[PDB]
Amino acid sequence: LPGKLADCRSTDPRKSELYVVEGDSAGGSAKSGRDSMFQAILPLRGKIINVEKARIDRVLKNTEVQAIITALGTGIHDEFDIGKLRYHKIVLMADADVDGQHISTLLLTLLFRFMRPLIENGHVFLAQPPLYKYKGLGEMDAKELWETTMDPSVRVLRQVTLDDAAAADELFSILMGEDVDARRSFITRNAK
Amino acid sequence: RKSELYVVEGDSAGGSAKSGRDSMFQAILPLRGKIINVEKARIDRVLKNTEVQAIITALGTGIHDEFDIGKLRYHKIVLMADADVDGQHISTLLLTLLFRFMRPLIENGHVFLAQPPLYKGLGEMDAKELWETTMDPSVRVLRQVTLDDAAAADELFSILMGEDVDARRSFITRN
Amino acid sequence: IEPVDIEQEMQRSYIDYAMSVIVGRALPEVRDGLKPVHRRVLYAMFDSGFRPDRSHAKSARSVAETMGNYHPHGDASIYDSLVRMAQPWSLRYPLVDGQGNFGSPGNDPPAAMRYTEARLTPLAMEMLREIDEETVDFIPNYDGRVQEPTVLPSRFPNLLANGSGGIAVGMATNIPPHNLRELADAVFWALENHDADEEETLAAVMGRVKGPDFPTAGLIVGSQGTADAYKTGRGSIRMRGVVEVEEDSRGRTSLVITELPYQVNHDNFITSIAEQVRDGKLAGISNIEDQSSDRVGLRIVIEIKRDAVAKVVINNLYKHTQLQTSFGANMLAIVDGVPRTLRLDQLIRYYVDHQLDVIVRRTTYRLRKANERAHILRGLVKALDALDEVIALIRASETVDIARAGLIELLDIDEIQAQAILDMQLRRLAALERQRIIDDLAKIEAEIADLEDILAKPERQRGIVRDELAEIVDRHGDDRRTRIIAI
Amino acid sequence: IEPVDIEQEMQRSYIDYAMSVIVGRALPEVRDGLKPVHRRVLYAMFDSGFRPDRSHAKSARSVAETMGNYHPHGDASIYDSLVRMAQPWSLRYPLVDGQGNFGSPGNDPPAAMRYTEARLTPLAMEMLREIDEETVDFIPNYDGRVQEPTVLPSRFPNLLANGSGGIAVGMATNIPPHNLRELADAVFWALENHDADEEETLAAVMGRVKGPDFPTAGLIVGSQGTADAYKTGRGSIRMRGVVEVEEDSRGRTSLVITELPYQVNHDNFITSIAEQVRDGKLAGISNIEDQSSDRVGLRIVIEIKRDAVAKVVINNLYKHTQLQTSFGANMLAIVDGVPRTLRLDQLIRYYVDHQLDVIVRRTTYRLRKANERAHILRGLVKALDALDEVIALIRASETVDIARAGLIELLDIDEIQAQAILDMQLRRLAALERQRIIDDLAKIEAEIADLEDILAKPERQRGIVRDELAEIVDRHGDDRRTRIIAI
DNA sequence: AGTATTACCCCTTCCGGT
DNA sequence: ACCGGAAGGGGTAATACT
Ligand SMILES: O=c1ccc2ncc(=O)n3c2n1CC3CN1CCC(NCc2cc3c(cn2)OCCC3)CC1
Ligand SMILES: [Mg+2]
Ligand SMILES: [Mg+2]
């Protein structure tokens, strides 16, 4: 298991939850205000590698990608087995600025490229923190983090759904592919 | 026979002295902070630090029994340190490392100490200010270390930087 | 090109470094109880405008201010000190109010300088009370640009209330935290009995002060160690946690740990117990779990399988797994620039003397300021007595200089007073202000007499100190967190 | 839970990030020629008081101020920009005066930040000239506490005199530095010929400005790449180093490289030459060494053994080891929040319009201030007309409000005028001050007339801009470090 | 080996253009 | 393969004492 993982206590996959959060200060703040029975925190580091651009042999040596794959438990590509999944709820919790919105899209594209059935089965969720009472998740303490985000009784989560596969396949390659002219044209068209 | 070695701490002062030196007859070696106390740690432990190995590789001579002075690469080893209290500690640690390992290198006159002008160190001085004060062979002033009594120096070294704490405290209080 | 020796250079450098570390790096101060880094950080936060009546400010600004103006050292150590001063589990009375992730009792590290914010606490503002009234000395900094104080007023005994800990060259210092409410009684006894000898003062102070009161509650076993520490200045105090026995529906017994001794890690405890359980240690444990929630506190569950009825397992935990530890109190402090080992009465008397000196200096400064203001106001009212002539002479003057000369030669008034004479505002010419001047002069000439009377009698100074300390203790008070039991 | 879908979230997140990067992260503003980080650093240093008149201050203080108040980002990206703005080999005209180890053209890092000090330069003062006179708009920062400018006055054309370079999401920008005098001539022509169309203005500004002037001296071959860059916005500019052939006493021929093209690493050049010599296929080369002393400058020595007469070795060095390189000029800027590629005439006209708007706003602010100031002097002289009656009324009153009402009823004045009369000092009641008030009123009226006349005719604003720009250019200005040769 | 002030330093990713 | 704004994080030493 990854050395930065803080595993939960319950051994039943149907009730556990895994939280993927950028940085270490946010992870340390969340570790104090979490329910140790059904919540595990996995702190990443920096920005994720772009799987859509790099080759397979390069993304298989990144420490963060290997740690995520080990923590999730399932295989990758054709070796994916849904029965080996450890957490039935993988929740992405990042900051509210543009850098967080980019780390989130990198993680989502990684999960779509490698573990598409996870998105297909709706095991992936997104967590939104409060705006103002806050420019980062590291400025919050345990009590405020619990009272708004991690409390199962009072919280709001978003479920990512996949209806059309071809549209997602083309859009991911357009937005995060090697080509630049198509990306620039898309950005200019969608700006207005 | 004409080259000189300048030992400094940190890459800031190291680069500052590198960019303001005479590249013909001057070499600069930077370190990474305080030195491991050789007198306290075992020989195996000190012989593993990545900085002591760098020092011995730079000097080129042997250590202890297998010491040959004919393999020396620089005929002038100058210890450069900041003027604060820390600069008076790191240097002294080095003054142990040369005494314990390369003992017959000191009494011959191959070790010198520089005197920076009175800044909080050499990391603040730029390239130009490090020439006309400490590195110009016609303007610089150094101090040469000499050995007169061997037993007295050894006992002073053991008292000051040994493992006994009460003796060191008594010596510090007395003097 | 000078033939210096190696023994002389070695001795000089080592002695200089050792004296610098001993006097200005690690050992605390008897009068204030703060190391130079703590005092510099507190003064930088006070002067820069970070106060409890203002919103939180980023710690980066205060750290940079301290690093630039006052403390010429690294940033990591300054930030570590700032974070430590704001941790409730490390300081009995915190001196910094922090917002953010400031750390955990376990192995979790605090966040970076960019995220956490910090300001002063209401108890910390009592340390800097009346610092601009020449109560303490000032000295120039390293580059000679600005001035910094040599010691804070320290209106409350911070040294004993918060403890101390430090490592120097050839010396060490360890002082345990105490309770402010019981230190107040000792200080009052010292103030009221200034003609007491050493033995009587020591006996009375030790009677009034029971023992240390660690911020993490816990337990203290025995009473000989505290007596040895207070009588001499070096002694061991035995600290112990609390263990609670509970059962379940199926009848399986359990052990609950909710408190741990001072300066004992939480993760290290759990790890050591787990490893010794995996190896052949203790007597019997089924499994160990941690349930220390944020809203619950500390709760460590240990399962004893079937036997021992949770009687000898507790003793094994006490004698094996750091559930009972020792505090090696050794009270070392710097007096007039020299380290010394002191008893309780020594610290109490030194603090009382410092408070008395601060009060005397403040009274003298206030008296001088009031006297100068009274002189100015008396000259002003003497001018006001002849307002028609003054205004007539002022109007018929070529320039200000001749008007000032005529004012000096007419009213028998020297300089300074004449400058304030010419600095009248017409708004202050109505009869209301012409009587307000009389009222102000009447008030000030009585304030001067009151201040002189205060300065003339030491009993007034002692009463002032007693009243202020009593008010401070009444506003900020705490109970005995640590319970002391017999052997 | 909410079914947020996958396409909408992806599009929203990536579009938001890309737009933020394009607008406020990489591309510079045409009017000011500064990225947001540079503008925030300059404003923080200007407001904190780090001015050329005052001594150097620690860079840690400036970084902390910029990060806490204006820039909500990491400290590395702030200090890196701060140290890059003070590097002579990177900026044609530095905007920061830095003391300490600020880096080297090779692989030496810039000192950590606790050893280096920084302050503003005279050029940055001209950049921040008259910023408090409502010349530019202000917006609140991220936390809404204080206000920060959205654009600096930029009294001199920083964008073209310093160049730019940046990478964004979907585009990139690169603009080479120019010469100040040549830009000044083009701006003067544009000011004097405001009615010219695009083609004539472009031809004139291409005639006045010859080509880029990199801070590292060097060389440039051809005249078509600069023409393409100026006419279409994209072009390729070829740069070349300076090599000299020398001979020793024995007769061996040596090549001395004394200048290198823009943004070429000194150590990587020697490393590449040595590796290519070791691998062969380059030429007959004896050895390569660096004799670049601090007091000598760049000096790279290459030895050729016996052949080539030092002619084909030069061509091989041109063709294989980066001694001759290319610059992909692509002028991209932000106009009104939109990224566009512009020619030289556009970049001149936009700056001219910005200067005219700044001058108009400053003149309007000064006129408003003078108009509001004249009222107090008019009230003061009106009171001076009946000074004796005013003084008698003031004396015969019980409260200041009664005096205010009496003054308003008597002198027929506003509340502000009566207040100014009341807070008039007695020292201003002499004859000299009585005449000084009249002189000040006359001068203020004359200044109001002059300021109104300035706004009356637009033909004076162009003259004012020309005079200020001419003074700025005559104060600071260099010559063509990079010379243009033929093919 | 762990408490607390001190000294110093490097190594992954994103985003184009040649 | 860098050029420049951005995200994030670990590891060697001194010095005492239990
Ligand atoms: O050299 C190294 C090698 C490895 C390493 N691993 C983790 C790590 O965090 N760091 C590692 N390093 C270095 C470094 C951190 N470095 C020093 C502290 C600095 N603190 C941030 C800061 C400092 C200041 C601020 C604001 N923020 O304002 C006032 C002045 C000082 C950030 C960069
Ligand atoms: Mg952030
Ligand atoms: Mg230093």
Side-chain angles (χ1 to χ4, degrees):
Chain A
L1 300 200
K4 326 165 290 193
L5 189 60
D7 228 355
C8 44
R9 283 200 306 254
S10 58
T11 75
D12 195 53
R14 275 88 210 155
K15 294 199 128 295
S16 298
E17 278 158 32
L18 167 70
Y19 272 77
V20 159
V21 51
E22 65 148 57
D24 188 30
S25 153
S29 180
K31 277 177 10 198
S32 199
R34 61 142 181 164
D35 193 23
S36 170
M37 210 74 197
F38 307 115
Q39 290 182 347
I41 311 291
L42 173 64
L44 300 186
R45 213 193 70 168
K47 288 197 157 167
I48 322 298
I49 186 153
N50 197 348
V51 190
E52 195 87 4
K53 286 184 191 171
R55 333 193 325 143
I56 315 286
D57 62 340
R58 204 184 157 239
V59 317
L60 259 193
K61 293 190 318 183
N62 204 6
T63 314
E64 164 263 343
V65 167
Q66 293 273 56
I68 284 190
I69 290 173
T70 300
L72 261 79
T74 59
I76 64 169
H77 283 301
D78 40 19
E79 205 250 319
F80 183 82
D81 207 320
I82 202 66
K84 277 115 188 82
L85 184 50
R86 315 178 42 187
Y87 310 91
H88 264 53
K89 268 192 183 189
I90 296 114
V91 167
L92 294 158
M93 157 168 127
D95 279 313
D97 39 8
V98 284
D99 312 291
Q101 288 181 290
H102 196 219
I103 294 186
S104 149
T105 192
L106 287 178
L107 285 164
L108 210 35
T109 207
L110 153 76
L111 294 181
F112 185 84
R113 282 294 131 178
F114 282 4
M115 320 172 179
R116 186 159 147 283
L118 282 202
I119 295 172
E120 273 267 8
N121 274 42
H123 292 320
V124 192
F125 293 107
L126 264 70
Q128 73 254 50
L131 289 122
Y132 293 119
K133 289 283 255 169
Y134 275 136
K135 265 277 146 178
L137 254 289
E139 311 171 354
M140 288 208 260
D141 35 37
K143 184 52 191 173
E144 293 176 358
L145 252 169
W146 168 263
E147 248 188 275
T148 321
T149 321
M150 278 164 317
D151 193 285
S153 320
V154 45
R155 73 167 185 195
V156 47
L157 287 195
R158 295 174 281 206
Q159 179 154 358
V160 284
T161 326
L162 170 96
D163 201 13
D164 251 342
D169 212 322
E170 61 96 10
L171 188 127
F172 270 92
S173 72
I174 282 289
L175 276 178
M176 313 215 68
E178 312 225 355
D179 219 351
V180 193
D181 45 55
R183 147 158 61 257
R184 153 192 309 130
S185 309
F186 195 78
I187 290 171
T188 304
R189 184 211 321 300
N190 288 114
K192 176 176 164 184
Chain B
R1 259 206 53 118
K2 304 202 271 313
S3 292
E4 310 151 61
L5 177 70
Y6 284 58
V7 178
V8 289
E9 329 82 349
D11 292 10
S12 35
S16 174
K18 214 188 305 302
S19 100
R21 85 201 214 259
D22 167 39
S23 166
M24 177 92 209
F25 294 137
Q26 274 163 344
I28 318 292
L29 176 72
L31 304 186
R32 203 186 275 224
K34 299 214 197 238
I35 323 297
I36 165 160
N37 196 356
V38 180
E39 179 96 19
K40 279 180 194 180
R42 307 184 169 179
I43 303 198
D44 168 25
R45 219 193 150 236
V46 47
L47 259 300
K48 247 189 305 195
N49 203 5
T50 63
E51 182 264 315
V52 189
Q53 306 271 50
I55 274 185
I56 322 311
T57 322
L59 263 82
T61 56
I63 38 184
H64 280 297
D65 182 30
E66 53 159 70
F67 180 85
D68 209 332
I69 209 178
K71 304 162 61 73
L72 190 47
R73 288 188 61 194
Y74 311 95
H75 263 56
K76 238 182 179 161
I77 297 129
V78 170
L79 306 167
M80 226 160 164
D82 315 272
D84 42 9
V85 284
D86 282 298
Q88 291 156 295
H89 191 222
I90 303 188
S91 96
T92 207
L93 298 176
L94 287 176
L95 227 42
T96 292
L97 193 143
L98 300 198
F99 192 89
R100 288 292 148 197
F101 287 3
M102 288 85 101
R103 194 223 186 263
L105 190 137
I106 275 171
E107 72 271 50
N108 289 353
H110 302 349
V111 173
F112 299 88
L113 290 139
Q115 163 84 330
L118 57 105
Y119 328 97
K120 264 278 155 165
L122 294 325
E124 294 187 352
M125 291 165 108
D126 43 357
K128 208 75 180 80
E129 216 146 3
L130 258 171
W131 180 247
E132 55 245 41
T133 66
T134 61
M135 266 161 141
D136 203 325
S138 325
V139 194
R140 77 163 168 223
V141 288
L142 312 170
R143 316 190 290 265
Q144 155 160 279
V145 290
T146 46
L147 207 33
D148 187 28
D149 231 323
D154 194 19
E155 76 141 342
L156 182 75
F157 266 76
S158 42
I159 280 296
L160 277 167
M161 223 161 311
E163 259 306 347
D164 210 350
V165 179
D166 283 290
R168 151 153 74 262
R169 173 209 308 137
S170 297
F171 185 62
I172 281 163
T173 279
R174 172 66 195 79
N175 291 96
Chain C
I1 43 177
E2 300 189 36
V4 87
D5 201 343
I6 192 157
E7 286 179 83
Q8 289 190 356
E9 150 71 40
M10 271 285 298
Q11 159 171 332
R12 206 203 75 237
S13 306
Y14 203 80
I15 283 186
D16 285 359
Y17 162 80
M19 301 295 208
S20 154
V21 152
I22 280 166
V23 190
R25 184 151 302 182
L27 297 203
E29 182 138 41
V30 55
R31 306 185 289 159
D32 183 33
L34 286 176
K35 319 195 183 197
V37 56
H38 302 347
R39 170 184 316 123
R40 279 153 182 179
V41 157
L42 284 197
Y43 187 49
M45 283 171 51
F46 167 77
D47 195 62
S48 185
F50 321 127
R51 278 154 206 231
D53 73 79
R54 206 200 89 156
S55 61
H56 282 93
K58 318 280 295 180
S59 38
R61 303 168 65 195
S62 70
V63 165
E65 167 43 353
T66 314
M67 203 213 318
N69 260 300
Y70 306 110
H71 204 47
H73 285 117
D75 42 322
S77 94
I78 295 176
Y79 184 55
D80 289 347
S81 148
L82 185 131
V83 161
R84 165 158 217 273
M85 271 188 319
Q87 279 192 28
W89 47 82
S90 87
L91 266 206
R92 174 75 159 99
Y93 300 108
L95 306 184
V96 162
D97 192 292
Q99 170 149 294
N101 176 35
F102 264 75
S104 160
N107 266 320
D108 293 358
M113 255 170 287
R114 155 179 62 262
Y115 290 114
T116 73
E117 326 176 348
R119 78 178 154 185
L120 275 182
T121 48
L123 201 56
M125 282 295 297
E126 321 295 330
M127 204 100 65
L128 306 132
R129 188 116 72 78
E130 296 160 17
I131 201 169
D132 44 58
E133 325 212 334
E134 308 202 10
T135 36
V136 296
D137 278 345
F138 272 82
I139 49 147
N141 60 351
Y142 49 95
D143 47 6
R145 274 162 41 249
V146 308
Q147 311 241 320
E148 53 162 333
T150 41
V151 56
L152 298 185
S154 189
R155 295 311 281 249
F156 80 99
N158 181 36
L159 174 60
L160 295 156
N162 283 335
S164 281
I167 300 130
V169 167
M171 291 157 204
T173 290
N174 226 359
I175 296 169
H178 288 13
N179 199 346
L180 183 59
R181 201 173 281 169
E182 70 186 15
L183 283 154
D185 312 4
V187 178
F188 296 155
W189 194 96
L191 283 168
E192 205 145 31
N193 295 68
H194 61 297
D195 319 288
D197 52 76
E198 310 208 20
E199 196 89 74
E200 210 192 24
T201 311
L202 180 53
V205 161
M206 202 176 328
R208 259 85 166 166
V209 188
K210 286 158 200 335
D213 179 30
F214 305 114
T216 166
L219 256 163
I220 284 175
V221 188
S223 73
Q224 169 72 15
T226 320
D228 276 337
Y230 291 168
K231 266 184 312 201
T232 89
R234 204 171 311 81
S236 170
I237 308 164
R238 276 184 51 184
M239 283 141 40
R240 173 195 305 198
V242 294
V243 277
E244 180 55 71
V245 280
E246 65 111 18
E247 290 78 66
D248 52 2
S249 67
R250 265 82 66 185
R252 300 186 186 94
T253 35
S254 278
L255 272 76
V256 170
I257 308 170
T258 45
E259 298 185 354
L260 294 178
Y262 191 36
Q263 254 168 359
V264 160
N265 225 347
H266 288 15
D267 295 303
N268 282 21
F269 181 84
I270 216 82
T271 288
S272 178
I273 279 191
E275 303 217 322
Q276 278 206 108
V277 152
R278 278 162 32 219
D279 299 11
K281 292 294 182 180
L282 290 316
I285 305 138
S286 157
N287 49 358
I288 174 188
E289 217 161 50
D290 156 79
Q291 299 171 355
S292 34
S293 188
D294 167 50
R295 49 221 61 96
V296 169
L298 180 64
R299 188 194 209 83
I300 291 175
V301 159
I302 290 181
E303 283 282 339
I304 42 163
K305 26 184 60 171
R306 275 311 180 181
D307 316 306
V309 195
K311 182 52 174 74
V312 291
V313 187
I314 283 176
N315 283 108
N316 275 357
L317 288 170
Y318 280 179
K319 70 170 57 49
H320 264 87
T321 36
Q322 213 167 27
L323 197 40
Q324 163 198 317
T325 184
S326 306
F327 191 93
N330 167 33
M331 319 202 150
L332 192 55
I334 293 170
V335 303
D336 73 273
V338 161
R340 257 170 77 187
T341 316
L342 309 165
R343 325 178 286 242
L344 207 41
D345 61 314
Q346 310 262 348
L347 314 158
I348 293 304
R349 289 294 198 213
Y350 287 151
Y351 172 81
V352 163
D353 204 352
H354 170 62
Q355 277 318 120
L356 282 176
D357 207 3
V358 157
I359 285 299
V360 171
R361 278 163 93 89
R362 185 251 275 149
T363 310
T364 303
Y365 165 89
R366 284 181 166 183
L367 168 65
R368 154 166 74 76
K369 207 66 56 162
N371 214 348
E372 89 176 20
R373 184 171 321 131
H375 181 112
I376 271 291
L377 208 59
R378 174 211 331 281
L380 182 43
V381 70
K382 157 136 84 176
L384 215 180
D385 259 345
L387 189 42
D388 302 319
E389 286 84 359
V390 160
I391 202 63
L393 165 55
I394 276 185
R395 267 163 67 79
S397 289
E398 291 295 319
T399 193
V400 189
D401 203 348
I402 317 144
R404 163 175 333 141
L407 265 45
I408 275 190
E409 210 67 27
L410 154 75
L411 288 172
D412 192 350
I413 271 173
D414 208 358
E415 260 171 16
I416 312 118
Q417 328 179 204
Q419 206 53 238
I421 284 187
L422 271 150
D423 284 12
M424 210 78 79
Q425 281 182 108
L426 282 184
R427 188 170 30 79
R428 288 171 30 109
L429 221 62
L432 211 53
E433 290 79 20
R434 314 166 56 250
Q435 225 282 326
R436 183 99 55 85
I437 297 264
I438 313 294
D439 287 332
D440 287 13
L441 178 53
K443 276 188 249 183
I444 296 299
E445 72 202 310
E447 290 201 342
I448 282 136
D450 178 282
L451 260 45
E452 266 174 85
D453 176 40
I454 273 177
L455 261 173
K457 288 199 277 287
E459 319 104 44
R460 289 213 70 177
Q461 309 161 7
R462 260 141 56 190
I464 284 168
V465 177
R466 173 207 63 217
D467 289 331
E468 270 142 35
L469 188 40
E471 145 185 319
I472 279 168
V473 160
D474 283 335
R475 185 162 335 127
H476 308 109
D478 268 27
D479 81 286
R480 293 262 320 164
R481 275 227 187 87
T482 279
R483 187 162 84 79
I484 162 166
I485 75 171
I487 312 280
Chain D
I1 40 153
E2 282 292 323
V4 74
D5 214 283
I6 189 55
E7 280 139 10
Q8 354 282 317
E9 180 51 68
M10 272 296 88
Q11 256 181 69
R12 212 195 51 105
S13 189
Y14 205 61
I15 285 322
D16 284 28
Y17 168 74
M19 217 72 59
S20 174
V21 175
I22 276 168
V23 172
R25 197 198 196 182
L27 312 180
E29 188 90 58
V30 50
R31 316 132 73 167
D32 187 36
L34 282 176
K35 304 198 199 189
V37 45
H38 317 324
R39 162 185 314 122
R40 275 149 184 182
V41 167
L42 290 187
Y43 191 64
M45 263 197 311
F46 165 70
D47 217 3
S48 296
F50 315 134
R51 269 156 220 209
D53 325 307
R54 294 321 188 246
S55 314
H56 280 93
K58 186 73 50 209
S59 44
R61 292 169 71 198
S62 163
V63 169
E65 278 278 82
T66 313
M67 188 195 23
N69 258 324
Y70 304 103
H71 206 44
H73 285 250
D75 60 297
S77 92
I78 292 177
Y79 181 59
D80 272 3
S81 151
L82 187 131
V83 74
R84 203 251 191 192
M85 288 194 316
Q87 274 179 359
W89 50 88
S90 268
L91 279 207
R92 179 77 168 86
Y93 299 108
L95 305 177
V96 168
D97 199 284
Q99 188 164 63
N101 178 28
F102 264 53
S104 266
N107 290 325
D108 289 309
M113 86 178 60
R114 36 157 308 208
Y115 318 89
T116 74
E117 304 145 335
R119 88 185 155 191
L120 282 179
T121 40
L123 267 294
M125 301 304 316
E126 317 286 336
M127 280 217 88
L128 300 142
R129 162 118 61 85
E130 272 132 23
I131 204 179
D132 45 65
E133 310 209 47
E134 217 143 7
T135 43
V136 294
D137 283 341
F138 271 60
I139 55 170
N141 47 348
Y142 55 101
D143 52 3
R145 293 221 340 269
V146 293
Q147 315 242 303
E148 47 152 341
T150 180
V151 48
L152 291 195
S154 191
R155 283 323 285 271
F156 87 97
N158 185 56
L159 182 58
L160 290 151
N162 270 353
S164 171
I167 310 110
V169 174
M171 51 195 78
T173 194
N174 232 11
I175 300 164
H178 287 29
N179 202 320
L180 195 44
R181 298 201 222 254
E182 281 154 17
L183 291 161
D185 309 343
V187 173
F188 293 160
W189 191 96
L191 273 180
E192 104 183 331
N193 262 72
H194 61 89
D195 253 332
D197 37 21
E198 315 94 334
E199 301 66 351
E200 210 197 328
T201 290
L202 171 59
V205 304
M206 194 134 63
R208 298 292 193 284
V209 198
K210 299 294 182 336
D213 183 15
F214 311 109
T216 83
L219 222 69
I220 177 168
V221 302
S223 276
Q224 207 249 330
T226 87
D228 294 339
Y230 292 160
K231 240 153 72 192
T232 89
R234 317 208 53 247
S236 177
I237 287 147
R238 323 207 44 200
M239 326 175 259
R240 173 184 299 183
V242 163
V243 196
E244 191 65 31
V245 202
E246 76 185 25
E247 292 207 50
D248 62 342
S249 55
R250 269 78 59 195
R252 305 258 277 193
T253 50
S254 317
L255 268 50
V256 177
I257 310 183
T258 53
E259 286 176 8
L260 276 176
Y262 189 36
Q263 269 180 343
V264 154
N265 233 304
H266 283 18
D267 287 325
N268 282 54
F269 178 84
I270 317 151
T271 282
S272 154
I273 292 207
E275 299 313 273
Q276 234 164 3
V277 152
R278 162 200 87 193
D279 231 5
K281 215 200 51 54
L282 184 69
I285 301 277
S286 312
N287 63 351
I288 318 109
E289 66 180 4
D290 218 60
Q291 295 194 20
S292 36
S293 181
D294 162 89
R295 53 214 72 80
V296 161
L298 178 55
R299 188 174 195 276
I300 303 178
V301 176
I302 312 203
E303 199 144 8
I304 44 154
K305 30 189 56 152
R306 285 277 102 181
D307 288 6
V309 205
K311 178 58 79 74
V312 313
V313 172
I314 293 173
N315 285 56
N316 276 6
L317 288 154
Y318 283 30
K319 214 72 61 193
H320 288 109
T321 174
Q322 211 165 57
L323 198 70
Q324 199 214 34
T325 183
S326 293
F327 191 95
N330 171 28
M331 320 201 154
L332 209 157
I334 294 280
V335 277
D336 282 335
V338 190
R340 308 179 16 194
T341 284
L342 321 155
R343 322 180 295 259
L344 200 57
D345 64 323
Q346 321 247 340
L347 294 162
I348 287 291
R349 289 280 183 212
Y350 287 152
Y351 172 81
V352 159
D353 299 346
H354 171 74
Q355 279 319 292
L356 286 194
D357 176 38
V358 159
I359 293 287
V360 156
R361 281 175 62 126
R362 164 176 75 87
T363 284
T364 284
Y365 169 89
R366 284 161 156 215
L367 162 71
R368 155 161 77 78
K369 231 69 191 164
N371 234 5
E372 96 166 34
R373 196 261 204 277
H375 205 97
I376 289 166
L377 280 173
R378 285 196 206 133
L380 257 163
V381 63
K382 209 189 305 289
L384 269 172
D385 279 17
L387 187 46
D388 196 21
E389 279 111 306
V390 159
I391 276 183
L393 181 163
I394 275 171
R395 279 258 301 284
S397 300
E398 59 268 23
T399 49
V400 289
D401 284 279
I402 300 299
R404 269 202 261 183
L407 280 178
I408 292 170
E409 190 82 281
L410 160 45
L411 297 173
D412 177 318
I413 50 178
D414 206 302
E415 195 85 15
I416 314 293
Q417 327 186 200
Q419 197 64 72
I421 293 157
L422 274 157
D423 317 54
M424 170 166 68
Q425 307 194 2
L426 287 198
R427 91 162 70 245
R428 305 182 61 220
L429 228 65
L432 246 181
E433 322 275 0
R434 288 203 297 266
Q435 286 308 315
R436 264 183 197 157
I437 291 180
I438 310 279
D439 309 333
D440 291 15
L441 183 46
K443 290 168 62 174
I444 281 289
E445 270 286 350
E447 291 192 326
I448 287 154
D450 198 0
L451 266 307
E452 275 171 293
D453 198 10
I454 275 179
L455 292 153
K457 318 178 190 85
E459 68 246 16
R460 277 188 77 181
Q461 291 149 20
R462 304 205 253 274
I464 294 160
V465 178
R466 189 204 72 239
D467 290 345
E468 308 273 43
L469 186 44
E471 291 206 2
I472 288 177
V473 160
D474 265 283
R475 219 94 61 89
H476 324 105
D478 311 328
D479 263 348
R480 285 292 308 250
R481 306 201 212 196
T482 278
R483 74 222 74 160
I484 311 178
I485 63 169
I487 290 285

